[PDB]
Structure formats: C-alpha cells, structure tokens
C-alpha cells in the first residue's frame, strides 16, 4: 500500500513544495513588471509634457 498509494500520495503532497516553485514564476513575472510595466506608466509624463 505504501508503494501503491504512498508514492502517488507523496507526489500529491509535494504539490505543496511545487506551490512555491510555481508561485516563483508569478513572483518573477511581477519582478519583470517592476521594470517593464513601470515603463508603460512613465510615458504618461510625456502625455502631460
């Protein structure tokens, strides 16, 4: 049972470990926006000037 259920259940459980390792890509998306999307706000200065 520990090799029938247990393996697959531990794969399920390590979905918890994967939560960080996939949230990481969201976080590095936002850490790109902090360069790339600020650059969409900035030319609104030109929109005024």
């Amino acid at each position: 049972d520990a090799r029938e259920w247990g393996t697959n259940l531990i794969d399920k459980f390590t979905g918890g470990i994967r939560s960080k390792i996939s949230g990481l890509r969201n976080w590095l998306s936002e850490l790109r926006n902090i360069g790339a999307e600020v650059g969409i706000d900035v030319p609104t200065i030109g929109g005024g000037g």
Partner: protein, 32 residues
Amino acid sequence: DGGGGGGATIDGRQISESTGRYRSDPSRRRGI
C-alpha cells in the same frame, strides 16, 4: 505632476487736415 505642469497714437495734423472739408461745411451751407 507631468500633467500638473500642463496647467493708439494719433496725429493732430492729419486729423485737423482731414476734417477741414467738414468743419467749413455748415458755413458754406449758410453762404459765408
């Protein structure tokens, strides 16, 4: 803040010369 930064001299000779034809008119209308 980029948006915020987006907020007669008259010649007495030429009058008196031009009006002469009109100033004399009532007297001509009355003969002399």
